[PDB]
Design an enzyme around this catalytic site. Structure first.
Site, PDB file in Angstrom:
ATOM      1  N   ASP A   1      -1.361   5.601  -5.359  1.00 16.38           N
ATOM      2  CA  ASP A   1      -1.831   4.706  -4.271  1.00 16.38           C
ATOM      3  C   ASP A   1      -2.099   3.290  -4.765  1.00 16.38           C
ATOM      4  O   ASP A   1      -3.098   3.056  -5.451  1.00 16.38           O
ATOM      5  CB  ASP A   1      -3.121   5.275  -3.690  1.00 16.38           C
ATOM      6  CG  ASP A   1      -3.581   4.549  -2.433  1.00 16.38           C
ATOM      7  OD1 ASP A   1      -2.860   3.650  -1.909  1.00 16.38           O
ATOM      8  OD2 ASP A   1      -4.681   4.912  -1.961  1.00 16.38           O
TER       9      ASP A   1
ATOM     10  N   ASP B   1       0.829  -1.207   0.000  1.00 17.37           N
ATOM     11  CA  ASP B   1       0.000   0.000   0.000  1.00 17.37           C
ATOM     12  C   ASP B   1       0.853   1.242   0.000  1.00 17.37           C
ATOM     13  O   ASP B   1       1.424   1.590   1.035  1.00 17.37           O
ATOM     14  CB  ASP B   1      -0.889   0.014   1.255  1.00 17.37           C
ATOM     15  CG  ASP B   1      -1.927   1.140   1.248  1.00 17.37           C
ATOM     16  OD1 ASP B   1      -2.200   1.720   0.182  1.00 17.37           O
ATOM     17  OD2 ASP B   1      -2.513   1.435   2.310  1.00 17.37           O
TER      18      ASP B   1
HETATM   19  C1  LIG Z   1      -7.407   3.833   0.006  1.00 16.11           C
HETATM   20  N1  LIG Z   1      -6.809   3.357   1.258  1.00 16.11           N
HETATM   21  C2  LIG Z   1      -7.578   3.253   2.356  1.00 16.11           C
HETATM   22  O1  LIG Z   1      -8.746   3.548   2.336  1.00 16.11           O
HETATM   23  C3  LIG Z   1      -7.046   2.711   3.653  1.00 16.11           C
HETATM   24  C4  LIG Z   1      -5.939   1.736   3.349  1.00 16.11           C
HETATM   25  C5  LIG Z   1      -5.124   1.556   4.612  1.00 16.11           C
HETATM   26  C6  LIG Z   1      -6.575   0.433   2.911  1.00 16.11           C
HETATM   27  C7  LIG Z   1      -7.248  -0.348   3.859  1.00 16.11           C
HETATM   28  C8  LIG Z   1      -7.861  -1.551   3.507  1.00 16.11           C
HETATM   29  C9  LIG Z   1      -7.807  -2.004   2.196  1.00 16.11           C
HETATM   30  C10 LIG Z   1      -7.129  -1.246   1.238  1.00 16.11           C
HETATM   31  N2  LIG Z   1      -7.057  -1.650  -0.103  1.00 16.11           N
HETATM   32  C11 LIG Z   1      -7.643  -2.677  -0.740  1.00 16.11           C
HETATM   33  O2  LIG Z   1      -8.374  -3.522  -0.248  1.00 16.11           O
HETATM   34  C12 LIG Z   1      -7.354  -2.806  -2.194  1.00 16.11           C
HETATM   35  C13 LIG Z   1      -8.168  -3.613  -2.989  1.00 16.11           C
HETATM   36  C14 LIG Z   1      -7.868  -3.708  -4.344  1.00 16.11           C
HETATM   37  C15 LIG Z   1      -6.765  -2.996  -4.858  1.00 16.11           C
HETATM   38  O3  LIG Z   1      -6.450  -3.090  -6.184  1.00 16.11           O
HETATM   39  C16 LIG Z   1      -6.842  -4.299  -6.815  1.00 16.11           C
HETATM   40  C17 LIG Z   1      -6.605  -4.136  -8.292  1.00 16.11           C
HETATM   41  F1  LIG Z   1      -5.303  -4.220  -8.444  1.00 16.11           F
HETATM   42  F2  LIG Z   1      -7.066  -2.977  -8.720  1.00 16.11           F
HETATM   43  F3  LIG Z   1      -7.237  -5.088  -8.937  1.00 16.11           F
HETATM   44  C18 LIG Z   1      -5.986  -2.206  -4.027  1.00 16.11           C
HETATM   45  N3  LIG Z   1      -6.304  -2.133  -2.727  1.00 16.11           N
HETATM   46  C19 LIG Z   1      -6.531  -0.029   1.594  1.00 16.11           C
HETATM   47  N4  LIG Z   1      -5.084   2.345   2.333  1.00 16.11           N
HETATM   48  C20 LIG Z   1      -5.524   2.964   1.328  1.00 16.11           C
HETATM   49  N5  LIG Z   1      -4.687   3.179   0.301  1.00 16.11           N
END
Ligand SMILES: CN1C(=O)C[C@@](C)(c2cccc(NC(=O)c3ccc(OCC(F)(F)F)cn3)c2)N=C1N
Ligand code: NA
Ligand code: NA
Length: 371
Positions: A221, A37
């Site tokens: 991000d 992340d």
């Molecule tokens: C946006 N964001 C937040 O809202 C808080 C935090 C910690 C966070 C917390 C929990 C989950 C996530 N991210 C995800 O679940 C996620 C899911 C799919 C993602 O991309 C998948 C794909 F690559 F697009 F297919 C990326 N991140 C981020 N970090 C972030 N970057």
């Protein structure tokens, strides 16, 4: 420098659930899958038997654990988690051959955080101390890494969008991209904040005041799926995408990500959808470059049904995994810049490919930054 075979292909994921790296915590090493992340700064892992988790950090089993006797509560836009802070020895099996003492938040209670059916158990925040919780004195993992070892202060991401990719820690791997890297300054070290100076849909300027593109910031991000755009830019953006694609029609709720749209296999109309180009601030006064993404990136398969992966925002532009899957992205922390190159692995067709092109002449790029 330039070659890191051991780190190639060290990322795994499932469509929609994020990219994760294998890590170990404590002694003896406890293996966990950790979400990569670039939009947050805490290293936080499941520490208790939540039902969605394959495994979790068991602090009692580690001789190297040290309690910081301190709690952290972390709310997000939707969902939260809270935890207990400590340090322990961390490794990345398919990363550099080092071991570091890092801060870890042991998640003891969470809500809408872990994903049912996902294969990760924690999250690695790769952004800066400024946005760390509870505050900037909790040292993020990558800082501890660079402070305690010889690992150079940079990392790079090749996200290929079931899915895989590479996180090269401490360098760049030249096999992961084609052509040249182009660099954009990191405006301020908190998120990986950048400045977009111009936006074209199908080579057509939105002619919006560029300040609007960065209202109130633009960040890179890996923990966001969508290309997220500020409200006013999004309206402009879709209006121009709606029009560029008016050759066929879809419900209004589709553009708001309130419904999916579906076509038949072997036959999605990619070509009626426009390319999107973001011009980023360059390294030189009055010089920019542009990144070009395809509908392949912003139309993401769901399970042929797709979601429109461009959405409106109140937190500014977010270049999520939608943009990043087009490119090899270099987080050059040592020089406060982000490099973009065409990814060797990106998804395209035979008519259009993702692109990184420069230099262009763009004046008053400083006025594009919101204050
Ligand atoms: C946006 N964001 C937040 O809202 C808080 C935090 C910690 C966070 C917390 C929990 C989950 C996530 N991210 C995800 O679940 C996620 C899911 C799919 C993602 O991309 C998948 C794909 F690559 F697009 F297919 C990326 N991140 C981020 N970090 C972030 N970057
Ligand atoms: Na060092
Ligand atoms: Na190359």
């Amino acid at each position: 420098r330039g070659s890191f075979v051991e780190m190639v292909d060290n990322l795994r994921g499932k469509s929609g659930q994020g990219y994760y790296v294998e890590m170990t915590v404590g002694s003896p090493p406890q293996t966990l899958n950790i979400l990569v992340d670039t939009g947050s700064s805490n290293f936080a892992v499941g520490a208790a038997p939540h039902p969605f988790l394959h495994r979790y950090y068991q602090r009692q089993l580690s001789s190297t654990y040290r309690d910081l006797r301190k709690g952290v509560y972390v709310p997000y836009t939707q969902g939260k988690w809270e935890g207990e802070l400590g340090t322990d020895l961390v490794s990345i099996p398919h990363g550099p051959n080092v071991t570091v003492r890092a801060n870890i938040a042991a998640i003891t209670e969470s809500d809408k955080f872990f994903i049912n059916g996902s294969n990760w158990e924690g999250i690695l925040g790769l952004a800066y101390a400024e946005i760390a919780r509870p505050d900037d004195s909790l040292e993020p993992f990558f800082d501890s890494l660079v402070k305690q070892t010889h690992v150079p202060n940079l990392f790079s991401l090749q996200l290929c969008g079931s899915v895989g990719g590479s996180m090269i820690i401490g360098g760049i791997d030249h096999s992961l991209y084609t052509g040249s890297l182009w660099y954009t300054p990191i405006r301020r070290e908190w998120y990986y904040e950048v400045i977009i100076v111009r936006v074209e849909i199908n080579g057509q300027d939105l002619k919006m005041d560029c300040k609007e593109y960065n209202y109130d910031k633009s960040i890179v991000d890996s923990g966001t799926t969508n290309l997220r755009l500020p409200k006013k830019v999004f309206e402009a953006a879709v209006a121009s995408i709606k029009a560029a694609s008016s050759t066929e029609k879809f419900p209004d709720g589709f553009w708001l990500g309130e419904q999916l749209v579906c076509w038949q296999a072997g036959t999605t109309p990619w070509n009626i959808f426009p390319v999107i180009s973001l011009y980023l601030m360059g390294e030189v006064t009055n010089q920019s470059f542009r990144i070009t993404i395809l509908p392949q990136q912003y139309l993401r398969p769901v399970e042929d049904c797709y979601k429109f992966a461009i959405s409106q925002s109140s937190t500014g532009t977010v270049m999520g995994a939608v943009i990043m899957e087009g490119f090899y992205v270099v987080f050059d922390r040592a020089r406060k810049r982000i490099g973009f190159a065409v990814s060797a692995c990106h998804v395209h067709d035979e008519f259009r490919t993702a692109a990184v092109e420069g230099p262009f002449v763009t004046l008053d790029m400083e006025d594009c930054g919101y204050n």
